[PDB]
Amino acid sequence: SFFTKLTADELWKGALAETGAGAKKGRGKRTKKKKRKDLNRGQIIGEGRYGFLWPGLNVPLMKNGAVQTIAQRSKEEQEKVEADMIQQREEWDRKKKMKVKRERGWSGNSWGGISLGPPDPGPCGETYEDFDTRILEVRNVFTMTAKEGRKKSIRVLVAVGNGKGAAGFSIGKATDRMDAFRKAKNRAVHHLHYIERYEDHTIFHDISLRFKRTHIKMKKQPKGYGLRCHRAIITICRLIGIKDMYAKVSGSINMLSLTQGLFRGLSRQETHQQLADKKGLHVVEIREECGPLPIVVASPRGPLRKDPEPEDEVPDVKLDWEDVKTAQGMKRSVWSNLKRAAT
Amino acid sequence: RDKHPPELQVAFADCAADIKSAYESQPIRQTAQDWPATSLNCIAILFLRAGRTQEAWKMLGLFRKHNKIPRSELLNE
Amino acid sequence: RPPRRKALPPRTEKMAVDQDWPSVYPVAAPFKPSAV
């Protein structure tokens, strides 16, 4: 019956079944999903199976200065049109099938390590093209609710940085994973730390700190050492601009504790100029590749002390057994100093 | 053709601008834009007499791009 | 590329305030914004 026919929108809303108890709680999963297709896309007004040529609708109205008359394509001429539409339909299906693959993160199914692009431009014509965003954690949080039972939300941790010392991180929360990405990355750009870098490649000194139960021990390293650190630290260090560092994470390996523990330690590092100003002495760098040449890296801006720094015969500094065990050749690990890809 | 009171001259510059847009956005744009010499000379002169000197100075480049002879009156103004 | 067609200005802008309106709406016709 002609009167029982419906519109395309009605037919797709029913067939897709996007509203319903199946889609409310994700009670139904979709390895095979009906996909909406626009069936009016490649259709031309006036074109039908019979192949009639209507002047002014599907063919030009005037030809050679005279009005065209009703005509019909030959059976052969119409087969070509039909075949051409099928090929054009498969070409469109293949153009959509040809989608550029995006690089993976720490693993194929992991979100961690994936770039989200620069933060969105602020309302007042503000732009952050110089900043890159990296995901550090994507979690599904399940909230028990008074009336709706277990609901599913997304908590995202992302870090931003420009590669020149300015970096920050923020948590994002939303029901949708892509809204959480927007919240986290946009908020992080307003909570940027500045991290001082020695020679724009490493930290100024060894940093060992604890944040809650996460211990992070970082070592200053020379050029060419690379980033031999927890994969999350590697991600953050590329955003800050540190190229050479060793780091070891102990205790709880909690991503959030690690991120803010890492940023707390890197933001409280004393530069060489601050050391010279604090002690009013020269800072002299001795490099074995340069032999005994003394390289003054920092000199005090104020007066220069005349009294040498007291030489305590034995320092009362606390040592790490892991560092000492390594220097004494008593550290045996099959996993240490393994060959890995450039980081 | 001739100079006019400031009120009229301003109105002629609003039309010359709209004509300029027509020359710039022709549907023969696929073919090289044909900017007659008289049209370029008149449109520039109308901008000067209206006080839109900034627009007139910019147009001088189009005399070299299209290789159109500038009119004596335009150079003196 | 052919320019997209531009809708003309509503012909109300050409109507004089002392016109003969019955000539605009001589017979029953639907409301036309461009004509009223």
């Binding site: 989608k99 550029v100 995006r102 | - | 320019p3």
Partner: peptide, 16 residues
């Protein structure tokens, strides 16, 4: 996402 996400002027009176 890693497969890819590819959902993918002038006006004239009496045009031609």
């Amino acid at each position: 996402y890693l497969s890819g996400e590819e959902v993918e002027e002038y006006e004239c009176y009496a045009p031609d």
